[PDB]
Amino acid sequence: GLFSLDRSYEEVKAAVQQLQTITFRDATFTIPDPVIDQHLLIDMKTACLSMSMVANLASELTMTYVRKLALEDSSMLLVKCQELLMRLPARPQHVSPDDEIARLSALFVMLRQLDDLIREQVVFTVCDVSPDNKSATCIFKG
Amino acid sequence: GPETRPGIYVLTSSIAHWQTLVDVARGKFARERCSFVNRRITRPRQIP
Amino acid sequence: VDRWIRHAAGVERPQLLDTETISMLTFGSMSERNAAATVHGQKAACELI
Amino acid sequence: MSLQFIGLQRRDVVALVNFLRHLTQKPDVDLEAHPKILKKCGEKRLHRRTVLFNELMLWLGYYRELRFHNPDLSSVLEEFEVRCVAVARRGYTYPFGDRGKARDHLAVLDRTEFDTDVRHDAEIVERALVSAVILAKMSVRETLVTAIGQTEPIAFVHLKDTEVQRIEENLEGVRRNMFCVKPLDLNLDRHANTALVNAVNKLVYTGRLIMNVRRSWEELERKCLARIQERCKLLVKELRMCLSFDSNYCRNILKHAVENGDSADTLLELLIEDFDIYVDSFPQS
Amino acid sequence: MSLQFIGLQRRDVVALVNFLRHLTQKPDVDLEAHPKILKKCGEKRLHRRTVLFNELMLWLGYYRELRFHNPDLSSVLEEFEVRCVAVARRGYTYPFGDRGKARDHLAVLDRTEFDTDVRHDAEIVERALVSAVILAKMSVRETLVTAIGQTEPIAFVHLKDTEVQRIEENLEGVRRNMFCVKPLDLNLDRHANTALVNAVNKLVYTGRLIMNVRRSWEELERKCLARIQERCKLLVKELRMCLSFDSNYCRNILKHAVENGDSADTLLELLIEDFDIYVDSFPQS
């Protein structure tokens, strides 16, 4: 729904095609009619609301930290993730442990506000799956 | 501004799922939701 | 230089995009998929300069 | 364009030809405000036909120039959008005692523009300004009108009399000389109130500056047509008494309606090429 | 520091030095724009070796004053930086018939930046113009060209032919004079045109002002560099006819490659400081 905005309708089909497929866990999957809906418009609303405030709640030492780690450490995850970012020793501008611990505590709330929209009400907690893979025991149901 | 008042409510509802519950909750409480972002823009270096 | 290195050994990038399996790949997991056909069974060989 | 006259001396002509170039610098933009120019008409010293006709070339010449100059909306009209962008931006910020009622006041303030037509530009300021003044009192929680049918008069909030005595002079001095273009960007900012309320007083004053020049544009153009129409009908009875090929032709020129711009400009352009065919009707010397 | 010459009279040098002291004040800043300066060289009247020298001292002193003055695009560039993004905020507020196409030029305009390298400034303006005129046509709803590989021409839109003739005429002197810019041509504000179109018209007016200076600076500098080596390729052969010490001593100064103006900065002071030893090598009187 984010790509569908602000872009040509013919371009949307190129994105819906690669996104409707899901090759997760061996078996392939596909999404029937992912029509845009007002139910998405409110789902996009809570995500767009979280999309902004987390940038405000983020500490100056937090968002900067990924750009600074590349100066010394190097790793596979550091390189593959760095390409997604825009292209652009030194003292911290300020360090206030009480002010900084407060910035993080508020930051967790918006994450739960944002993470939950992809989360679902968990219902099962399977233990020992049957060998046939046609049945399994469950707990926490409801 | 001067003070953040508590606003207690008891709210029975047939809804049980957390996703469906919070969504309808934003209609009745949209005004207080507007107050939250408003406190942020007015007060840099303050994080309610 | 790293692009020339992985192409030299032929090793693929872990993925063109960062799935959670890629973070799981650094967590410790069976990185290699099973071959499409294995008439010879299990294979192994190490190295000592 | 090419004004012409009968009984005027050559010295009287140069004073009128210079009136075109010198009109922009003149204090008090009103021919009624400068009687001495009308005392050059030669009244009570020449025949009434030549005298009453003498004003018509001057009133049309006074009319041809005012449209030729146009109000100098220039950058100043663009400046109204600049301060309006600041008040519109801060209206999403400051909390109020309502929500959906102030919501319409902000969006209508965001709809403000400037029409391609020049006459209709006043209609946008006439409504967008009233929507902004109401917003400033809400920050003060000042009482708003509830009586049916009343629109709130323009009134600056929380400004000292030390500027009020002089700020009206700028609204009156620009009204005194519509050609003048004063930005009038004094130290409007104050420590009092807040950045939103101070932005409103900077903006509400800009709308009064446009409305005064706009009403002045119709204060003369609508008025001069009422005067030319008055001089025209009075001229009809005087020319009618004589029966001649020129005396009757002069009555035909007056048949055209004074109303509207181009229809009034047509009265002069038709008279320029035909000035000599009827000149014999007017006594000279 | 003083320029040196062989047989030229003192009456001629004063006309040449004043041409350099006030070259920015003079209309049309170009040597080919003043053929009479080459008539002061003593061409044909003097020996061809001296003719190459009387010119070579001018090409070094003409290039030196350009490097010494140096056009200040950065002041106008700061105004271009503010007008740049200001156009972009109007674009988000303005609905389009294709929401996705509009960002492709706006995203480049939001990416705008100014690297210290002035070589790319001719390219920086180009994407600023591709993001400009193509966007303004979408507001007018006139069809954009669909031909492959054909970037739209950049010019002012929807102006009167008398208006296009005036504001464009200033750009012709911007090539002739990159220093003393004299804009003062401001009446492009809306009145009739859409407000987003007006900022694009001022945007093209700034972008045409930049490209005309950076191109003339790149051209006049590249032009003098070729003319200097042409003086060397001929003079080294003309000096081959004689093997006198002073005739050969000049060739050692010419051994340096004259790539860019960097070697010329050493070539000029060295040629003047040691000029006295070989002044008699050139025939005179």
From Swiss-Prot, chain A:
Stated name of the protein: Triplex capsid protein 2
Location in or out of the cell: Virion; Host nucleus
Q: Which family does it belong to?
A: Belongs to the herpesviridae TRX2 protein family.
User: What biological function has been recorded for the protein in this entry?
Assistant: Structural component of the T=16 icosahedral capsid. The capsid is composed of pentamers and hexamers of major capsid protein/MCP, which are linked together by heterotrimers called triplexes. These triplexes are formed by a single molecule of triplex protein 1/TRX1 and two copies of triplex protein 2/TRX2. Additionally, TRX1 is required for efficient transport of TRX2 to the nucleus, which is the site of capsid assembly.
Underlying gene: TRX2
- Full-protein residues shown here are 154 to 306 of 306
Q: Which organism is it from?
A: Human cytomegalovirus (strain AD169) (HHV-5)
Quaternary structure note: Interacts with TRX1 and major capisd protein/MCP.
Curated annotation (Swiss-Prot), chain B:
Top-level lineage group: Viruses
Disulfide bond positions: none
Tell me the compartments it is located in: Virion; Host nucleus
Q: Where are the transmembrane segments?
A: none
Q: What does this protein do?
A: Structural component of the T=16 icosahedral capsid. The capsid is composed of pentamers and hexamers of major capsid protein/MCP, which are linked together by heterotrimers called triplexes. These triplexes are formed by a single molecule of triplex protein 1/TRX1 and two copies of triplex protein 2/TRX2. Additionally, TRX1 is required for efficient transport of TRX2 to the nucleus, which is the site of capsid assembly.
Describe the protein's quaternary organization and the partners it interacts with: Interacts with TRX2, MCP and capsid vertex component 2/CVC2.
Report the family membership. Answer: Belongs to the herpesviridae TRX1 protein family.
Name of the protein described by the UniProt record: Triplex capsid protein 1
Organism (species)? Human cytomegalovirus (strain AD169)
Swiss-Prot record, chain C:
- Highest taxon in the source lineage: Viruses
The protein's location, in the record's own words, is: Virion; Host nucleus
Please state which protein family the record places this protein in: Belongs to the herpesviridae major capsid protein family.
Describe the subunit structure: Homomultimer. Makes the hexons and eleven out of twelve pentons. Interacts with triplex proteins 1/TRX1 and 2/TRX2; adjacent capsomers are linked together in groups of three by triplexes, heterotrimeric complexes composed of one molecule of TRX1 and two molecules of TRX2. Interacts with scaffold protein; this interaction allows efficient MCP transport to the host nucleus. Interacts with capsid vertex component 2/CVC2. Interacts with the small capsomere-interacting protein/SCP.
What is the role of this chain?
Self-assembles to form an icosahedral capsid with a T=16 symmetry, about 200 nm in diameter, and consisting of 150 hexons and 12 pentons (total of 162 capsomers). Hexons form the edges and faces of the capsid and are each composed of six MCP molecules. In contrast, one penton is found at each of the 12 vertices. Eleven of the pentons are MCP pentamers, while the last vertex is occupied by the portal complex.
Return the protein name.
Answer: Major capsid protein
Q: Which gene encodes it?
A: MCP
- Which part of the entire sequence is included in the shown chain? 1127 to 1175 of 1370
From Swiss-Prot, chains D, E:
In which family does this protein belong, per the annotation? Belongs to the herpesviridae large structural phosphoprotein family.
What are the subcellular locations of this protein?
Virion tegument; Host cytoplasm; Host nucleus
Which gene does this sequence derive from?
UL32
Q: Mind telling me how this protein is modified after translation?
A: Phosphorylated by host CCNA2.
Described by its record, this protein's role is as follows: Participates in the last steps of viral maturation and release. Associates with nuclear capsids prior to DNA encapsidation and later preserves the integrity of nucleocapsids through secondary envelopment at the assembly compartment. Interacts with host CCNA2 and thereby blocks the onset of lytic gene expression to promote establishment of a quiescent state of infection in undifferentiated cells.
Q: What is this protein called?
A: Large structural phosphoprotein
Please give the start and end residues of each transmembrane region: none
**Quaternary context:** Interacts with host BICD1 and RAB6A. Interacts with small capsid protein UL48A; this interaction links together the capsid and pp150. Interacts with host CCNA2.
User: Covered range within the whole protein?
Assistant: 1 to 285 of 1048
